[PDB]
Design an enzyme around this catalytic site. Structure first.
Site, PDB file in Angstrom:
ATOM      1  N   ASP A   1      14.603  18.937   5.709  1.00  0.00           N
ATOM      2  CA  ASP A   1      15.271  18.037   4.659  1.00  0.00           C
ATOM      3  C   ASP A   1      14.127  17.233   3.883  1.00  0.00           C
ATOM      4  OD1 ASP A   1      17.693  17.777   7.713  1.00  0.00           O
ATOM      5  OD2 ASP A   1      18.151  18.694   5.607  1.00  0.00           O
TER       6      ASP A   1
ATOM      7  N   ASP B   1       6.606  17.382 -10.491  1.00  0.00           N
ATOM      8  CA  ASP B   1       7.791  16.588 -10.751  1.00  0.00           C
ATOM      9  C   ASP B   1       7.504  15.694 -12.072  1.00  0.00           C
ATOM     10  OD1 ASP B   1       7.300  14.634  -7.537  1.00  0.00           O
ATOM     11  OD2 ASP B   1       6.290  14.520  -9.553  1.00  0.00           O
TER      12      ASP B   1
ATOM     13  N   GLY C   1      -4.019   8.297 -10.356  1.00  0.00           N
ATOM     14  CA  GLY C   1      -5.592   8.241  -9.504  1.00  0.00           C
ATOM     15  C   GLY C   1      -5.578   6.948  -8.535  1.00  0.00           C
TER      16      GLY C   1
ATOM     17  N   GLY D   1      15.301  16.455  -2.764  1.00  0.00           N
ATOM     18  CA  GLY D   1      15.980  15.365  -2.450  1.00  0.00           C
ATOM     19  C   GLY D   1      15.596  15.022  -0.958  1.00  0.00           C
TER      20      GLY D   1
ATOM     21  N   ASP E   1      12.263  14.272  -0.403  1.00  0.00           N
ATOM     22  CA  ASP E   1      11.048  14.576  -0.102  1.00  0.00           C
ATOM     23  C   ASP E   1      10.059  13.456  -0.435  1.00  0.00           C
ATOM     24  OD1 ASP E   1      10.986  18.091  -1.192  1.00  0.00           O
ATOM     25  OD2 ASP E   1      11.825  17.130   0.346  1.00  0.00           O
TER      26      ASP E   1
ATOM     27  N   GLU F   1      -2.848  11.481  -2.982  1.00  0.00           N
ATOM     28  CA  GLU F   1      -4.257  12.006  -2.459  1.00  0.00           C
ATOM     29  C   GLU F   1      -5.471  11.165  -3.053  1.00  0.00           C
ATOM     30  OE1 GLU F   1      -4.619  14.306   0.364  1.00  0.00           O
ATOM     31  OE2 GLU F   1      -6.014  12.576  -0.029  1.00  0.00           O
TER      32      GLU F   1
ATOM     33  N   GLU G   1      -5.373   8.037  -3.328  1.00  0.00           N
ATOM     34  CA  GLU G   1      -5.563   6.871  -2.467  1.00  0.00           C
ATOM     35  C   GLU G   1      -6.437   7.288  -1.210  1.00  0.00           C
ATOM     36  OE1 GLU G   1      -4.921   4.733  -3.816  1.00  0.00           O
ATOM     37  OE2 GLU G   1      -3.419   5.572  -5.199  1.00  0.00           O
TER      38      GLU G   1
ATOM     39  N   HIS H   1       7.886   2.974   4.358  1.00  0.00           N
ATOM     40  CA  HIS H   1       8.546   2.569   2.882  1.00  0.00           C
ATOM     41  C   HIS H   1       9.055   3.904   2.521  1.00  0.00           C
ATOM     42  CE1 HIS H   1       8.530   0.204  -0.665  1.00  0.00           C
ATOM     43  NE2 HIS H   1       8.611   1.492  -1.379  1.00  0.00           N
ATOM     44  N   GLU H   2       8.264   4.807   2.323  1.00  0.00           N
ATOM     45  CA  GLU H   2       8.625   6.043   1.725  1.00  0.00           C
ATOM     46  C   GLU H   2      10.184   6.697   2.111  1.00  0.00           C
ATOM     47  OE1 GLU H   2       6.632   5.044  -1.219  1.00  0.00           O
ATOM     48  OE2 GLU H   2       7.988   6.694  -1.226  1.00  0.00           O
TER      49      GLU H   2
ATOM     50  N   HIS I   1      13.229   5.204   1.434  1.00  0.00           N
ATOM     51  CA  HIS I   1      13.765   5.712   0.369  1.00  0.00           C
ATOM     52  C   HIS I   1      14.265   7.291   0.560  1.00  0.00           C
ATOM     53  CE1 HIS I   1      12.150   2.820  -2.464  1.00  0.00           C
ATOM     54  NE2 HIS I   1      10.901   3.028  -2.522  1.00  0.00           N
TER      55      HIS I   1
HETATM   56  O1  LIG Z   1       7.798   2.008  -4.860  1.00  0.00           O
HETATM   57  C1  LIG Z   1       6.914   3.079  -5.004  1.00  0.00           C
HETATM   58  C2  LIG Z   1       5.776   3.249  -6.005  1.00  0.00           C
HETATM   59  N1  LIG Z   1       5.148   2.013  -5.832  1.00  0.00           N
HETATM   60  S1  LIG Z   1       4.083   1.475  -4.569  1.00  0.00           S
HETATM   61  O2  LIG Z   1       3.540   2.924  -4.223  1.00  0.00           O
HETATM   62  O3  LIG Z   1       2.750   1.220  -4.942  1.00  0.00           O
HETATM   63  C3  LIG Z   1       4.947   1.716  -3.104  1.00  0.00           C
HETATM   64  C4  LIG Z   1       3.673   1.400  -1.842  1.00  0.00           C
HETATM   65  C5  LIG Z   1       4.137   0.658  -0.796  1.00  0.00           C
HETATM   66  C6  LIG Z   1       5.058  -0.441  -0.889  1.00  0.00           C
HETATM   67  C7  LIG Z   1       5.559  -1.000   0.289  1.00  0.00           C
HETATM   68  C8  LIG Z   1       5.261  -0.712   1.438  1.00  0.00           C
HETATM   69  C9  LIG Z   1       4.494   0.280   1.645  1.00  0.00           C
HETATM   70  C10 LIG Z   1       4.055   0.999   0.589  1.00  0.00           C
HETATM   71  N2  LIG Z   1       7.018   4.107  -4.054  1.00  0.00           N
HETATM   72  O4  LIG Z   1       7.980   4.373  -3.195  1.00  0.00           O
HETATM   73 CA   LIG Z   2      -7.473  10.995  -0.322  1.00  0.00          CA
HETATM   74 CA   LIG Z   3      -2.393   6.112  -7.062  1.00  0.00          CA
HETATM   75 CA   LIG Z   4      14.308  18.194   0.730  1.00  0.00          CA
HETATM   76 ZN   LIG Z   5       5.942  13.628  -6.549  1.00  0.00          ZN
HETATM   77 ZN   LIG Z   6       9.111   2.255  -3.270  1.00  0.00          ZN
END
Ligand SMILES: O=C(CNS(=O)(=O)CCc1ccccc1)NO
Ligand SMILES: [Ca+2]
Ligand SMILES: [Ca+2]
Ligand SMILES: [Ca+2]
Ligand SMILES: [Zn+2]
Ligand SMILES: [Zn+2]
Length: 158
Positions: free
Chosen positions: A53, A65, A71, A87, A89, A94, A96, A113-114, A117
């Site tokens: 999933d 995508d 960078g 969906g 994913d 990299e 970072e 955080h990801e 989402h």
């Molecule tokens: O929101 C984003 C794009 N911006 S941010 O990458 O820089 C999110 C990074 C983040 C935010 C809060 C907590 C941990 C990592 N991706 O999900």
């Molecule tokens: Ca890296």
């Molecule tokens: Ca970056």
């Molecule tokens: Ca998926």
């Molecule tokens: Zn991507």
């Molecule tokens: Zn986010």
């Protein structure tokens, strides 16, 4: 927005950042999933093959995508809301430098955080919430979801 309509959710790690020890990547991602399963009915399992999933990808620049990475700095990662194919994913830039600690960008905290989402959560305006749009290091050994994150996820699940 979309949500998973099932309790057993699988993830697969597509490839591993060279920035970290392999076992540390596995554990950071596992711990991040645990944050969310702790407060929902969801159960997460790592599969090593086939279609998961949630596919966890490390990539840089244009990576197939519409969310090209930029960078070092800026966008650290991005993820897709629940759904078929891509969906769910979660992609990590990299460019970072991923770590287990306060140096570079902490993988665990970003993965929390990801995965938020990947489960259907949007951003929070509360600077204390993990779903706040700005990365801020906090001690990972005592990390706890904010009340705002708890209300958000519980509005979607359970
Ligand atoms: O929101 C984003 C794009 N911006 S941010 O990458 O820089 C999110 C990074 C983040 C935010 C809060 C907590 C941990 C990592 N991706 O999900
Ligand atoms: Ca890296
Ligand atoms: Ca970056
Ligand atoms: Ca998926
Ligand atoms: Zn991507
Ligand atoms: Zn986010």
């Amino acid at each position: 927005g979309p949500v998973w309509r099932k309790h057993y959710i699988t993830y697969r790690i597509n490839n591993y950042t060279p920035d970290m020890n392999r076992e540390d990547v596995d554990y950071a991602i596992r711990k991040a999933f645990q944050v969310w399963s702790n407060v929902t009915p969801l159960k997460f399992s790592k599969i090593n093959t086939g279609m998961a999933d949630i596919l966890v990808v490390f990539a840089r620049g244009a990576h197939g995508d519409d969310h090209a990475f930029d960078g070092k700095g800026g966008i650290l990662a991005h993820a897709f809301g629940p759904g078929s194919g891509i969906g769910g994913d979660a992609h990590f830039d990299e460019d970072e430098f991923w770590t287990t600690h306060s140096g570079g960008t902490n993988l665990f905290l970003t993965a929390v955080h990801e995965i938020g989402h990947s489960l259907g959560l949007g951003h929070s305006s509360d600077p204390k919430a993990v779903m706040f749009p700005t990365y801020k290091y906090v001690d990972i050994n005592t990390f706890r979801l904010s009340a705002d994150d708890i209300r958000g996820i519980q509005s979607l699940y359970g």
